Amino acid sequence: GAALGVIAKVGVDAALQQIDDVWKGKTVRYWKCAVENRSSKTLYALGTTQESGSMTTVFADIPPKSTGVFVWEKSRGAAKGAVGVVHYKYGNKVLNIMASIPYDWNLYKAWANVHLSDHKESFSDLYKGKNGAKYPTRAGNWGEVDGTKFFLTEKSHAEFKVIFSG
């Protein structure tokens, strides 16, 4: 499963562990992600909004009771962060997840956010708390928006965990 981007049965912690065997990477800022689908519907992979860098691994649909796994990396050679929004379809709704790992930790902090709405949300609206999104959650803290729980480690080489239940 890990090589396909999606693992059955396991939750976020176990899924994160399986990433290293199937991903290398050579950038100094990244976030590994696990999206645990405890809902009743498949989360269909819908897109990404690249603020800095990209999703560099396979992007899979997540059936109920599976966990999607992937990595977001800064661009090779950039002194920029790993910063992106990942979108899934949930019925006709859109699940938006965001994590932001800076290059310059002297100037910036690390942040995450989640928002289920009718559309793909911009990075800016997820970082500002606009258009219905909440103010973002600082790394190192459990967040919960509309019953979706999430956590981003405060690391250059981070882990972003999302548990979605509908």
Residue 32: closest CA among 165, 152, 166: 152
Cβ of 71: how many Cβ atoms within 10 Å?
A: 22
For 65, the 3-state DSSP assignment is coil
CATH code of the domain in which 60 resides:
2.60.270.20
| Residue range(s) defining the domain that contains residue 96 | 2-164
10 three-state secondary structure:
coil
Are residues 86 and 97 in contact, defined by beta-carbon separation less than 8 angstroms? yes
Measured distance CA(45)–CA(7) in Å, rounded: 15
Which tokens is 76 given? 């090779």
Element spanning 33, H or E: strand 30-37
Cβ–Cβ contacts within 10 Å for residue 38, how many? 15
User: What is the three-class DSSP state of 3?
Assistant: helix
Tell me if 64 sits within 8 A of 38, measured CB to CB: yes
Count of structural domains, the chain? 1
∠ CA 156-161-162, rounded to 5°: 140
3-state secondary structure of 139: coil
Q: Is the dihedral of CA 63, 65, 69, 72 positive or negative?
A: positive
What separation in angstroms does the CA of 166 have from each of 6, 127, 146, 147, 160? 18, 22, 9, 8, 19
